[PDB]
RNA sequence: UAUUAUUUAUUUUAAAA
């Protein structure tokens, strides 16, 4: 029995707890999760491995003699629906491996396309100005398409300023992430003609994008 | 002090020396073994200078790396207590330091074989504890002796000497009081040769008088090289 | 800066530079003569690595 | 038909006839209208009707099929780093862009070497690329290292008039005084070389003086006075 | 279409690799240690190996004192007025041998062939003195070229090479030749700091010899050599003596001559050894065609091969090597790495699959298609043949949990102003107003903007068709 | 009447010198060149605007002078056809032509005219043409005057800087680039000088078009 | 994986066949 709301410092439960139910004693294995930490406390000269919450929100328990994933999600259940923690959720939720992100092409190299991660999955997502919190990745030429990976042309697949929906591969070199677009649902999802100097273009073929009003066509690596 | 005789008819200056006599020259090597690769405590007259050479070492940032030679950085720190009146830091006083530091870098980068030490940097940290005239020449002597202690290969010695011209009489190793009353020339003589690596004239000197001042300047600088050379002989034989 | 020898038949080593068919010193130390290798061993000097040295180093 | 034009002026070509876009005119990606952006003489050629503006400029912009004189400023594993003009963006010169190239053999070009190349890629969003042999026609004669000699800085209009227009009397008035070999780059560079240095020096001073004096009829008196001065 | 010269050798080709490399040396001229003691196997637990002969010579011999001083460079011989001297008979070898004994400097270079030969074969030796240029047919004098040890080991004669890190190995393996007095102009160019350390850079700059450099990977076994290849071969050593004079004077002025001569001795001291008898520790003085405990591991990373298929690339790399030794071919001739990766990626079951691959198979794979198919099938059937909480519950058990919970319960029994100056001005929420026609402000309610927010988000995602 | 020259400086792509009354401004343009990491724009051209005073160091006064000069030249340049490039526009005020401690409109107006001419000499893609004039109204007799002298500024109620955009032979006023007004004025005086300024800028571009044509035409063929 | 690599390149052994 734990209080629903929690503050950083409120003791939740030790790593071991028992209770008699239906004449069958069970022992709970409480492991730390996102929002807790094992803190030793002293009241009579003997230590104990208790779990102490370190976030502002509600406590939630899950399962994988079983183990219990004791964690604290930040914010109130009414605040999560209003999404009042959009800026805090972007920085705290780093893009793990295998995630899907929405980036923006900022630099085109002959063998790579430097992008800037703007969102990430949580379809719901999470996105944060002078905040100073932004991630960046690199879309290598070998990860642009699945059909004929080597010997491609990134100038015909991306342009600076285009929005690209790409799935991450792994942490590139610590400085940058490694993304890929070798799927039909991955690629340019929002671009504009003449590097933003034209009209809003829309995806048509697997490698063709066109604007309705201007009628101009430009080759990309679309997603549909 | 007060109103004094600069060069009496008896050939005596205000501090007792004569026209061709240097101030007392007490140099020291390896004074900071656990803080730098080269150390030289220069004590020329009342001038007290600490010169520290740190290198050749890897640059802290690759933004200052040369793939064909070493980089030479000279940092001159003039303490607030180098004079009688504790001088306060002035925005104008920072420009004179940069000119001295640049003149020192350009001087020793031509004499120190930087090609032998590629992809490296050589930091020269200088602390002036007291000054009493001829400070520019004494800074040169501290760098030369500190580089030799660090085993840095050079072509020859670089001797620093300051010469003043009073009326028609040149005076060697000018002190603070003499610099306030006459024109001063600092010289950077290379070894026993008559070649100059530095020549600073910061006051008016007649053109017909400059020829003789340089001759007596390079001559007295050879004597400074001897005093520095002998100190290295005694420090090498006793160790 | 001083002259170590005026014999052109020598192989200049460390602490030594060639100039005008004559040989001068670049550091302050003792003169070394091994076969025909003329060099000067300076007093203070950092570690000079050579092939086959069991060293201990720290990753930078 | 040649007339002086200004930016924002009305383009004196009816939108009915298809016209090719050249250097000087700009097609707005929004309003789709063709409007000038530079200041100079407008040219229209009466099969295909192209139009461009001849504007005065000194900052070279890389364009494909252009012969340029570059300076090697960086050696790497598979390509050189070449500078076509000071302060501009550097261009790429691959090691395989040479006659008889090989992956197991590095070219004998160092930094500071002058090369006469051809721009083979000029993407606005990418780094420009050059090559020392035409990848389209297989040419290689004239491309490569420009040994010795002297390089000259001229405006882009003076360099283009010297390479294309055969009526430009600069090459002819120079041959009347000395034999030489010239390489003209569209990036505002002119490389000359003679047997004796005194002849190359007079060629440098003439091309310098003829570039600022736009009077084409004065080129004869410039070379006459310049070659006569070096004899003193 | 080219006959293998290995078939015409008087001494057979022994690719068995069943004993340490025995030097092909029978006489040791210009020696300080006797040859009778240089054939004792040196075993330091490294396998027992024959020591590199002339090693004591290169270590303890001094060059001529003339090399130390600077002399004026002598112009190389005229290129358009000179001709090579072909040496293919035993009589023509002695005429050149007695000419190389009467000189001070020589420029030597070799050509090699490794595609249709396991260890490889030397195909041409290029020797040139200050007077003439020689081209030696090392395929017909393979047993006769050991006479050159009188000149190649004479300290009074300088052997000018360029990148002799392989020529030293080729001389001792195929010709039994060793160099005492080496001057590698590669280490001379590397010490000076030239941008390119190649021989083409030294020709185009110091010799002013503009040359096309494509006759390197050519087949030097063919006879007679073509006119372009004869002119290319003589050019590798014709100007190397003039280049030697220029680079030597610069090394003296730069005080780098001592380092070049030191590195040159380390190049001449290189010892060839079979891969089976190679030292376990990497050394820059011993050479082996294979210098790794598992050469197929770098192929699995180069071609991205799963680690579970390592037993396959092991049995294919070892089979490919034994076949190359049997027919005296290179491993790439019987099966290149491009085809080796396809066999482990596609795993051809039937015999037809081994023959039909996109790149195309070699003739050794074509003949051994049944054997290779039986190998991949067997190795794949061996892959299919191959494929907690009570630790902490016993320490504390269950009845002792009531103690740690009672410890918890009674340990933690020990667990409004509106504003002062800025508390009622800063935490204020947003208030939006609108000026009416009479100029009076009208505050919109927080529910009016709520209507606007839900009306935009609902009307935004409601776009699924555009004409 | 105003004086103006083109192509005066050697080591830059385009230079100019604009003179009005006593205000003299020399401007230089270099571009497109390699931008710095903190300057490059992924899709369009980056501008580096620098104005330096005639006396003393560059203070915050020239910082707002840069910001206004930047707002005029930015829509006047086809930035999108120079992606990931830099243009350095540097204006040097030789003589202020006015009391620097009180007014700064005569220098802003000349920097606009000098920058536009220097951009023409450099070869940057310009969407149109531009003209700038200073405007003031006198206290005693509320009279609108164009290009006022230094003495008239010290006797004025409000000062104005009008920068217009001209297209099609310099007759169609496409837009009003900059109208900077300070002092005392009402809605009636604004449109009175705005209408008066539109015809004084209209004869400025007509004179500017003549100035640049007299210089560029001898260069070309 | 130094006969390997760095793309507006921090590689500092590209030499031999």
Curated annotation (Swiss-Prot), chain A:
Keywords: Cytoplasm, Exosome, Nucleus, Phosphoprotein, RNA-binding, rRNA processing. SUPFAM superfamilies: Nucleic acid-binding proteins. Gene3D superfamilies: 2.40.50.880, Nucleic acid-binding proteins (2.40.50.140). InterPro entries: Csl4, CSL4_N, EXOSC1_C, NA-bd_OB-fold. One of its GO terms (molecular function) is RNA binding. GO terms for cellular component: cytoplasm; cytoplasmic exosome (RNase complex); exosome (RNase complex); nuclear exosome (RNase complex); nucleolus; nucleus. GO terms for biological process: exonucleolytic trimming to generate mature 3'-end of 5.8S rRNA from tricistronic rRNA transcript (SSU-rRNA, 5.8S rRNA, LSU-rRNA); mRNA processing; nuclear polyadenylation-dependent rRNA catabolic process; nuclear-transcribed mRNA catabolic process; nuclear-transcribed mRNA catabolic process, non-stop decay; RNA catabolic process; RNA processing; TRAMP-dependent tRNA surveillance pathway. Pfam families: CSL4_N (PF21551), EXOSC1 (PF10447). The keyword rRNA processing applies. It is found in: Cytoplasm; Nucleus, Nucleolus. Component of the RNA exosome complex. Specifically part of the catalytically inactive RNA exosome core complex (Exo-9) which may associate with the catalytic subunits RRP6 and DIS3 in cytoplasmic- and nuclear-specific RNA exosome complex forms. Exo-9 is formed by a hexameric base ring of RNase PH domain-containing subunits and a cap ring consisting of CSL4, RRP4 and RRP40. Present with 5550 molecules/cell in log phase SD medium. Belongs to the CSL4 family.
From Swiss-Prot, chain B:
Keywords: Cytoplasm, Exosome, Nucleus, RNA-binding, rRNA processing. The keyword Transport does not apply. InterPro entries: ExoRNase_PH_dom1, ExoRNase_PH_dom2, ExoRNase_PH_dom2_sf, PNPase/RNase_PH_dom_sf, Ribosomal_Su5_D2-typ_SF, RNase_PH. GO terms for molecular function: RNA binding. One of its GO terms (biological process) is U4 snRNA 3'-end processing. Pfam families: RNase_PH, RNase_PH_C. One of its GO terms (cellular component) is cytoplasmic exosome (RNase complex). It is found in: Cytoplasm; Nucleus, Nucleolus. The keyword rRNA processing applies. SUPFAM superfamilies: Ribonuclease PH domain 2-like, Ribosomal protein S5 domain 2-like. Present with 5150 molecules/cell in log phase SD medium. PANTHER family: EXOSOME COMPLEX COMPONENT, EXOSOME COMPLEX COMPONENT RRP41. Non-catalytic component of the RNA exosome complex which has 3'->5' exoribonuclease activity and participates in a multitude of cellular RNA processing and degradation events. In the nucleus, the RNA exosome complex is involved in proper maturation of stable RNA species such as rRNA, snRNA and snoRNA, in the elimination of RNA processing by-products and non-coding 'pervasive' transcripts, such as antisense RNA species and cryptic unstable transcripts (CUTs), and of mRNAs with processing defects, thereby limiting or excluding their export to the cytoplasm. Belongs to the RNase PH family. This is Exosome complex component SKI6.
UniProtKB/Swiss-Prot annotation, chain D:
Pfam families: KH_6, Rrp40_N, RRP40_S1. It is found in: Cytoplasm; Nucleus, Nucleolus. The keyword Nucleus applies. Residues 63-133 form the S1 motif domain. One of its GO terms (cellular component) is exosome (RNase complex). The keyword rRNA processing applies. Keywords: Cytoplasm, Exosome, Nucleus, RNA-binding, rRNA processing. GO terms for molecular function: manganese ion binding; RNA binding. One of its GO terms (biological process) is RNA processing. InterPro entries: Exosome_RNA_bind1/RRP40/RRP4 (IPR026699), KH_dom_type_1 (IPR004088), KH_dom_type_1_sf (IPR036612), NA-bd_OB-fold (IPR012340), RRP40_KH-I (IPR049469), Rrp40_N_euk (IPR041054), Rrp40_S1 (IPR037319). Belongs to the RRP40 family. Component of the RNA exosome complex. Specifically part of the catalytically inactive RNA exosome core complex (Exo-9) which may associate with the catalytic subunits RRP6 and DIS3 in cytoplasmic- and nuclear-specific RNA exosome complex forms. Exo-9 is formed by a hexameric base ring of RNase PH domain-containing subunits and a cap ring consisting of CSL4, RRP4 and RRP40. Present with 6050 molecules/cell in log phase SD medium. This is Exosome complex component RRP40. The gene is RRP40.
Swiss-Prot record, chain F:
It holds the Pfam family RNase_PH_C. The keyword Cytoplasm applies. InterPro entries: ExoRNase_PH_dom1, ExoRNase_PH_dom2, ExoRNase_PH_dom2_sf, PNPase/RNase_PH_dom_sf, Ribosomal_Su5_D2-typ_SF, RNase_PH. GO terms for biological process: exonucleolytic trimming to generate mature 3'-end of 5.8S rRNA from tricistronic rRNA transcript (SSU-rRNA, 5.8S rRNA, LSU-rRNA); nuclear mRNA surveillance; nuclear polyadenylation-dependent mRNA catabolic process; nuclear polyadenylation-dependent rRNA catabolic process; poly(A)-dependent snoRNA 3'-end processing; RNA catabolic process; RNA processing; rRNA catabolic process. GO terms for cellular component: cytoplasmic exosome (RNase complex); exosome (RNase complex); nuclear exosome (RNase complex); nucleolus; nucleus. It is found in: Cytoplasm; Nucleus, Nucleolus. Gene3D superfamilies: GHMP Kinase, N-terminal domain. Transmembrane segments: none annotated. Keywords: Cytoplasm, Exosome, Nucleus, RNA-binding, rRNA processing. One of its GO terms (molecular function) is RNA binding. Its main location: cytoplasm. Belongs to the RNase PH family. Present with 10800 molecules/cell in log phase SD medium. Component of the RNA exosome complex. Specifically part of the catalytically inactive RNA exosome core complex (Exo-9) which may associate with the catalytic subunits RRP6 and DIS3 in cytoplasmic- and nuclear-specific RNA exosome complex forms. Exo-9 is formed by a hexameric base ring of RNase PH domain-containing subunits and a cap ring consisting of CSL4, RRP4 and RRP40. The gene is RRP46.
């Amino acid at each position: 029995q734990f209080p629903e709301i929690a503050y950083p410092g409120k003791l939740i439960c030790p790593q071991y707890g028992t209770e008699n139910k239906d004449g069958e004693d069970i022992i709970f294995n409480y492991v730390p999760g996102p929002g807790t930490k094992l803190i030793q406390y002293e009241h009579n000269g003997r230590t104990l491995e208790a779990i102490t919450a370190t976030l502002v929100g509600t406590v939630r328990c899950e399962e994988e003699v079983k183990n219990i994933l004791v964690s604290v999600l930040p914010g109130t259940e009414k605040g999560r629906k209003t999404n009042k923690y959009a800026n805090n959720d972007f920085a705290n939720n780093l893009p793990k491996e295998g995630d899907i992100v929405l980036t923006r092409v900022t630099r085109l190299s002959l063998q790579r396309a430097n992008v800037e991660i703007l969102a990430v999955e949580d379809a719901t997502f999470s996105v944060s100005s002078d905040l100073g919190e932004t991630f960046r990745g690199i879309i290598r030429s070998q990860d642009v398409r699945s059909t004929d990976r080597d010997r491609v042309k990134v100038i015909e697949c991306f342009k600076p300023g285009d929005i690209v929906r790409a799935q991450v591969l792994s942490l590139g070199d610590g400085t940058n992430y490694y993304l890929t677009t070798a799927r039909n649902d991955l690629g340019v999802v929002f671009a504009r003609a003449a590097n933003g100097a034209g009209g809003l273009m829309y995806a048509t073929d697997w490698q063709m994008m066109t604007s309705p009003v201007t009628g101009a066509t430009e080759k990309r690596k679309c997603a549909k | 002090m007060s109103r004094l005789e600069i060069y009496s008819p008896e050939g005596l200056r205000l501090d007792g020396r004569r026209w061709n006599e240097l101030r007392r020259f007490e140099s020291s090597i390896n004074t900071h073994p656990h803080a730098a690769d080269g150390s030289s405590y220069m004590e020329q007259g009342n001038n007290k200078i600490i010169t520290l050479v740190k290198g050749p070492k890897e640059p802290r940032l690759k933004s200052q790396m040369d793939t064909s030679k070493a980089l030479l950085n000279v940092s001159v720190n003039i303490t607030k207590f180098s004079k009688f009146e504790r001088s306060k830091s002035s925005h104008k006083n920072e420009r004179r330091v940069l000119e001295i530091q640049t003149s020192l870098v350009r001087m020793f980068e031509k004499n120190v074989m930087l090609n032998i030490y590629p992809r490296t940097v050589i930091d020269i940290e200088i602390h002036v504890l007291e000054q009493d005239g001829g400070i520019m020449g004494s800074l040169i002597n501290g760098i030369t002796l500190a580089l030799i202690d660090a085993g840095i290969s050079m072509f020859d010695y670089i001797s620093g000497i300051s010469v003043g011209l009073y009326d028609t009489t040149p005076l060697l190793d000018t002190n603070s009081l003499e610099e306030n009353a006459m024109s001063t020339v600092t010289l950077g003589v290379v070894g026993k040769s008559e070649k100059l690596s530095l020549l600073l004239v910061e006051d008016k000197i007649p053109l017909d008088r400059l020829e003789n001042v340089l001759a007596i300047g390079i001559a007295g600088a050879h004597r400074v090289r001897d005093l520095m050379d002998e100190e290295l002989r005694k420090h090498a034989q006793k160790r | 800066g001083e002259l170590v020898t005026d014999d052109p038949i020598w192989m200049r080593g460390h602490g030594t530079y060639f100039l005008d068919n004559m040989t001068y010193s670049s550091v302050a130390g003792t003169v070394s003569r091994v076969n025909r290798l003329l060099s000067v061993i300076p007093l203070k000097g950092r570690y000079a690595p050579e092939t086959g040295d069991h060293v201990v180093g720290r990753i930078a | 038909m040649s007339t002086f034009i200004f930016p924002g002026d009305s383009f004196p070509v009816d939108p009915t006839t298809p016209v090719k876009l050249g250097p000087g005119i700009y097609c707005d990606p929004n309003t789709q209208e063709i409007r000038p952006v530079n200041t100079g003489v407008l040219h229209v050629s009466a099969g295909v009707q192209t139009a461009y503006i001849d504007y005065s400029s000194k900052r070279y912009i890389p364009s494909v099929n252009d012969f340029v004189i570059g300076v090697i400023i960086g050696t790497f594993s598979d390509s050189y780093k070449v500078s076509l003009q000071n302060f501009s963006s550097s261009v790429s010169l691959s090691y395989m862009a040479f006659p008889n190239a090989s992956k197991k053999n590095r070219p004998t070009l160092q930094v500071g070497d002058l090369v006469y190349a051809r721009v083979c890629t000029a993407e606005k969003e990418l780094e420009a690329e050059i090559e020392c042999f035409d990848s389209t026609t297989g040419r290689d004669a004239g491309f490569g290292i420009l040994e010795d000699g002297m390089i000259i800085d001229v405006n882009l209009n003076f360099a283009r008039q010297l390479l294309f227009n055969n009526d430009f009397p600069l090459l002819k008035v120079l041959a009347a005084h000395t034999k030489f070999e010239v390489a003209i780059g569209l990036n505002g560079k002119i490389w000359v070389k003679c047997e004796e240095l005194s002849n190359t020096l007079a060629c440098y001073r003439t091309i310098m003086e003829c570039c600022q004096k736009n009077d084409t009829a004065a080129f004869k008196d410039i070379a006459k006075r310049q070659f006569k001065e070096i004899l003193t | 279409m080219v006959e293998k010269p290995q078939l015409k050798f008087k001494s057979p080709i022994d690719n068995s690799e069943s004993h340490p490399f025995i030097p092909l040396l029978k006489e040791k001229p210009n020696a300080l240690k006797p040859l009778s003691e240089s054939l004792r196997l040196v075993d330091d637990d490294n396998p027992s190996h024959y020591p590199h002969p002339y090693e004591y010579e290169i270590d303890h011999q001094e060059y001529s004192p003339e090399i130390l001083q600077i002399r004026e460079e002598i112009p190389s011989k005229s290129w358009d007025d000179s001709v090579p001297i072909w040496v293919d008979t035993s009589t023509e070898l002695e005429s050149m041998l007695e000419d190389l004994k009467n000189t001070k400097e020589i420029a030597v270079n070799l050509e090699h062939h490794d595609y249709r030969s396991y260890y490889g074969i030397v195909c041409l030796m290029q020797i040139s003195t200050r007077e003439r240029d020689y081209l030696v047919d090392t395929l017909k004098l393979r047993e006769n070229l050991h006479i050159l040890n009188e000149v190649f080991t004479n300290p009074s004669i300088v052997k000018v090479f360029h990148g002799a890190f392989m020529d030293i190995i080729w001389l001792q393996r195929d010709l039994g030749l060793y160099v005492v007095g080496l001057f590698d102009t590669y280490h001379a160019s590397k010490a000076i700091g030239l941008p390119r350390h190649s021989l083409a850079y030294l020709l185009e700059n110091f010799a002013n010899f503009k040359t096309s450099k494509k006759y390197q990977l050519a087949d030097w076994r063919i006879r007679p050599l073509s006119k372009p290849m004869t002119a290319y071969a003589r050019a590798d050593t014709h100007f190397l003596l003039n280049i030697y004079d220029q680079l030597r004077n610069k090394l003296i002025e730069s005080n780098k001559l001592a380092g070049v001569l030191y590195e040159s001795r380390n190049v001449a001291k290189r010892r060839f050894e079979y891969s089976k008898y190679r030292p376990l520790t990497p050394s820059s003085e011993v050479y082996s065609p294979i210098e790794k405990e598992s050469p197929w591991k770098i192929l699995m990373y180069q071609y991205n091969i799963p680690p579970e298929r390592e037993v396959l690339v092991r049995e294919l790399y070892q089979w490919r090597d034994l076949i190359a030794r049997r027919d005296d071919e290179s491993p790439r001739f019987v099966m290149p790495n491009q085809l080796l990766a396809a066999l482990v990626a596609y795993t051809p079951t039937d015999v037809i699959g081994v023959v039909s691959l996109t790149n195309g198979v070699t003739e050794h794979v074509r003949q051994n298609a049944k054997l290779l198919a039986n190998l991949i099938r067997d190795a794949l059937r061996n892959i299919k043949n191959t494929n907690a909480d009570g630790i902490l519950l016993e320490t504390i058990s269950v009845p002792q949990i009531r103690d740690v919970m009672e410890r918890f319960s009674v340990l933690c029994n020990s667990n409004t102003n509106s504003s002062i100056l800025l508390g009622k001005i800063l935490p204020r929420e947003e208030h939006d107003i609108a000026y009416s026609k009479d100029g009076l402000p009208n505050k919109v309610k927080t529910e009016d903007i709520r209507i606007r927010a839900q009306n935009f988000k609902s009307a935004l995602a409601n776009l699924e068709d555009i004409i | 009447s105003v004086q103006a020259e083109i192509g005066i400086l050697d080591h830059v792509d385009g230079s100019s010198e604009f003179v009005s009354q006593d205000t003299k401004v020399i401007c230089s343009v270099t571009g497109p060149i390699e931008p710095k990491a903190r300057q490059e724009l992924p899709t369009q051209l980056a501008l580096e605007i620098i104005v330096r005073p005639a006396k003393g160091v560059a203070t915050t006064r020239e910082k707002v002078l840069e910001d206004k000069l930047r707002a005029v030249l930015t829509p006047l340049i086809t930035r999108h056809c120079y992606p990931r490039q830099l243009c350095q526009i540097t204006c040097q005020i030789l003589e202020s032509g006015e009391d620097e401690a009180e007014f700064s409109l005569r220098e802003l107006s000349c920097c606009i005219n000098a920058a536009f001419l220097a951009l023409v000499d450099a070869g940057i893609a310009l969407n149109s043409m531009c003209a700038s004039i200073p405007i003031a109204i006198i206290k005693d007799t509320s009279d609108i005057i164009v290009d006022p002298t230094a003495e008239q500024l010290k006797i004025s109620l409000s000062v104005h800087t009008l920068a217009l955009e001209f297209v099609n032979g310099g007759k169609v006023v496409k837009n009003v680039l900059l109208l900077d007004s300070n002092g005392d004025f009402n809605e009636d005086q604004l449109f009175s000088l705005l209408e008066l300024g539109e015809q004084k800028c209209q004869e400025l571009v007509t004179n500017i078009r003549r100035i640049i044509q007299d210089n560029i035409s001898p260069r070309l063929v």
